[PDB]
Amino acid sequence: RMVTTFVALYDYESRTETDLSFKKGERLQIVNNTEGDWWLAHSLSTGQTGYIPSNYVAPSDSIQAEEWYFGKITRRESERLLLNAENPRGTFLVRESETTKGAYCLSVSDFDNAKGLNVKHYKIRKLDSGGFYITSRTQFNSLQQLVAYYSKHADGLCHRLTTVCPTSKPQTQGLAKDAWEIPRESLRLEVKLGQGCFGEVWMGTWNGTTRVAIKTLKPGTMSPEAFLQEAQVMKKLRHEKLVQLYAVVSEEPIYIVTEYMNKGSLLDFLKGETGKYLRLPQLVDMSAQIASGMAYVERMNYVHRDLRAANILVGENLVCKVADFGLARLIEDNEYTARQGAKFPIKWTAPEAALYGRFTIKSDVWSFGILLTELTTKGRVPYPGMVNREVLDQVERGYRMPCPPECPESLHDLMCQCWRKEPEERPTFEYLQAFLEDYFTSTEPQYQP
Ligand SMILES: Nc1ncnc2c1ncn2[C@@H]1O[C@H](COP(=O)(O)OP(=O)(O)O)[C@@H](O)[C@H]1O
Ligand SMILES: [Mg+2]
């Protein structure tokens, strides 16, 4: 539209030559309201120029520039951030209301003798004049004044506003502008994060600036021609609960570069000291994150084909994202193609997918039901007293895992819905997400009056 002045929200190290290195606070000259994930910018601070990630800047002198404004973040995700144990009382953020378009919301962390650590949500009424107010008896001209005022007096709020909600730098959309197929010499593998059946995983760095996860397929796993073909679709899948596909190295051995999840896989995270303190409310919430990512996959008319706790990756504040979606199809192994052998996840595979190769989003729904048993058992293998060989015949005859101990029979009933024989009667991920987000009377409710 018209080159305007922007401000940097976070630091960013120049990963390439064409991008722009800038620190939080730098005034940037960018073409206003220009579509894309990478915008051309001119730094009025350093006089340097280059492309910048569009989610690292906001118009100067706008609410988006304020560090306590989190934009279109959900009530459920705001609570995740605010309920962090290291946040003091009065840790807050401002966001948009999900139940009242045009209104804002002040989310604040608080402590109570009944609930303990909880978040209070206060709706902010914006006026035609531009003024904001939480209660009728105290009003302000700007959202900034409101924050300043309640940072000195609770005056009705559960607690004075103390700290702004901590946040980690968001992901850029792609490693760089036009960056997709990269050379192997651009990746530097630093730490082996783990090992799979068809290759290894690595913590590395691209251009020695940005930390990424590098998956290395052993030769013969999949043809580069078909991997690149499918990778043009996986690069389109962008959602907060999907691990982002960054780049690829075409020449075998194929390397897959993805966003790095520091807490490891959900399965391992459910075991050991990490999973000791997890309680059902957190497991249900983690299920809702997974269902949200799969609901996006469901909207894009895509199929995961290998949904299981081992392919869910954990981050800070118990963030969970779906990983390794769409790779299972490209496996060239004759035994995995015919879903046989000790390397096929038969215990997460719907019977019609294992018997007739009918992989659909509904067979992922089946997999989700299995995944829920891993969550409510903290990593226990499905069908524990059964070997792969015998699972498919038992579920084909109608056997279903019973309600695990420490699993509410209401969630096992959800599991059995996912385990219906008829795929088209299995529920959607839109349903599962809403069900699991509202499991504890948690359906968008109760802004404090
Ligand atoms: N994007 C990632 N970020 C951080 N760690 C990862 C990532 N992807 C995989 N890992 C780690 O590497 C290991 C191997 O992953 P993978 O080869 O997909 O094994 P599988 O899918 O069979 O569990 C996992 O246990 C996980 O902890
Ligand atoms: Mg995997």
Residue numbers in the entry: 81 to 529
The authors write:
Src and Tec kinases are activated by engagement of intracellular ligands for their SH2 and SH3 domains, events that promote activation loop phosphorylation and downstream signalling. In summary, we present a general mechanism for the allosteric activation and autoinhibition of both Src and Tec family tyrosine kinases.
To our surprise, we discovered that both Itk and Src bind ADP significantly stronger than the non-hydrolysable ATP analogue, AMPPNP. To investigate the preferred binding of ADP at atomic resolution we determined the crystal structure of tail-phosphorylated Src in the presence of ADP and magnesium. Src32K crystallised in the same conditions as previously reported for the nucleotide-free protein and in the same space group. This results in a relative binding free energy for ADP over ATP of −18.9 kJ mol−1, confirming our experimental findings. Whilst the crystal structure of Src in complex with ADP shows minimal differences to AMPPNP-bound Src, molecular dynamics calculations of the free energy of binding reinforce the strong preference for ADP.
